[PDB]
């Protein structure tokens, strides 16, 4: 499960940590936010290699752009470099569903959903992965433009937790990022095992679960 949303303080990006092959949990320490450069983030869903490879390639194209133009690349331009690239490969079997997230002077906080069948969508809230429907529920019912940074971060964390609980293929730990105009800020790794009990107690949620 991966999500990103826009609010008054920028962008929150939150992801789980689990990779599976069939029922086998291959890893609980996967890094699903790829740090494109200090101002741009992308999220990993679909093929792990396709996301890693092409989004670090995107970082290279972004760097060349700003060397040539002496200006920060827009999120619009950066996201389109990726979508145009994967569109060239359409039909060959790339698998990718990603949110390209940034915050520039001209655009403000901006998120593009980009996908291996060539879709490129600008929006305020996206949620991608096997647990996406669980995350959306929490997001949709608590989201406001005017969340504080602190409450926005919690909401992103709480939404991934919801997904990790119910979705068999989501879990391990939650990674949080806050994207500001001056760059993204990492807000740590949160083991879901410990986080679940802590949230259940402090919030009184998950009464269905015995603790």
């Amino acid at each position: 499960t991966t999500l990103a949303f826009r609010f008054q303080g920028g962008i929150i990006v939150a992801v789980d940590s689990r990779a599976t092959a069939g029922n086998w949990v291959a890893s609980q320490t996967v890094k699903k936010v790829i740090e494109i450069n200090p101002f741009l983030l992308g999220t990993m869903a679909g093929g792990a290699a396709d996301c890693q490879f092409w989004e670090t390639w995107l970082g290279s194209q972004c760097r060349l752009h700003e060397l040539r133009e002496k200006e920060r690349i827009s999120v619009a331009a950066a996201s389109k470099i990726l979508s145009n690239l994967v569109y060239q490969y359409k039909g060959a079997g790339l698998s990718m569903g990603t949110m390209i997230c940034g915050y520039t002077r001209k655009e403000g906080p901006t998120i593009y959903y980009v996908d291996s069948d060539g879709t490129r969508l600008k929006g305020d809230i996206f949620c991608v992965g096997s647990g996406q429907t669980f995350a959306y529920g929490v997001l949709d019912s608590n989201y406001k433009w005017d969340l504080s940074v602190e409450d926005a971060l919690y909401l992103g964390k709480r939404s991934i937790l919801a997904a990790a609980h119910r979705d068999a293929y989501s879990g391990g730990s939650v990674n949080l990022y806050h994207v500001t105009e001056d760059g993204w800020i990492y807000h740590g790794n949160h083991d879901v095992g410990e986080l679940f009990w802590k949230v259940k107690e402090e919030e009184g949620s998950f009464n269905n679960v015995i603790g």
């Binding site: 827009s74 331009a77 389109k80 145009n84 001209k106």
Partner: protein, 240 residues
């Protein structure tokens, strides 16, 4: 494929085909550009050996590359079309992939790059063309004016002229253009531009074309009359 190195160095370190390309530019009709405080004007000389010319349809000397940028030139007319087509294609390609129209500088850098490539590729000769490229960057109100030449060097100018007798009109601009106070209106700028061409033109008749470019894709060519009123008022202040 025909591969011959036509642009090569001479013993004194000169590339004569590029230098001869500039000689073609010197022979072309004069072109001038002047930036005001909130506009840029492009003026072009029309050689008057051609009456019976149909001016509705005859290729105009200033060309829109996009809705916010224009290009004029001196030199081989046929050569200029090739650069204008390439620049227009690149302007649309930039909009398509970056989702923003070209900056005036980006567009200049592109055209200049095409000109340079034609000075060190086998089987081709350099463009016999220098250009003036003017406009406003998207969502920007600061005026832009650049110049390119056959070698592919380019640079930014407060005001500049190219083509035949441009030595003279540059003379005029260097003594009459004050950087600390650019022509603060369209009027002042257009008047300074028509004055600069009158140093060199002949009749201020349909010898002079003027195009004004303002911010936000506001581009308009003045007509014979409106220029004529500039020509008129200019000589009436003269006899004094």
């Amino acid at each position: 494929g025909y591969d011959r190195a036509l642009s090569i160095f001479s013993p004194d370190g000169h590339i004569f085909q590029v230098e001869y390309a500039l000689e073609a530019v010197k022979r072309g009709t004069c072109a001038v550009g002047v930036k005001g405080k909130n506009c840029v004007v492009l003026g072009c000389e029309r050689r008057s050996t051609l009456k019976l010319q149909d001016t509705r349809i005859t290729p105009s000397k200033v060309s829109k590359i996009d809705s916010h940028v224009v290009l004029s030139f001196s030199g081989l007319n046929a050569d200029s079309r090739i650069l204008i087509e390439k620049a227009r294609v690149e302007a649309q390609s930039h909009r398509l992939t970056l989702e923003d129209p070209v900056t005036v500088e980006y567009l200049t850098r592109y055209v200049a790059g095409v000109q340079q490539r034609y000075t060190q590729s086998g089987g081709v000769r350099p463009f016999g063309v220098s250009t003036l490229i003017a406009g406003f960057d998207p969502r920007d109100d600061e005026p832009k004016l650049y110049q390119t030449e056959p070698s592919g060097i380019y640079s930014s100018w407060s005001a500049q002229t190219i083509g035949r007798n441009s030595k003279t009109v540059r003379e005029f601009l260097e003594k009459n253009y004050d950087r600390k106070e650019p022509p603060a209106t369209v009027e002042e700028c257009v008047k300074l531009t028509v004055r600069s061409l009158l140093e060199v033109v002949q009749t201020g008749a349909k010898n002079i074309e003027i195009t004004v470019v303002k911010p936000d894709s506001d581009i308009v060519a003045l007509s014979s009359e409106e220029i004529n009123q500039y020509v008129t008022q200019i000589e009436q202040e003269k006899q004094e």
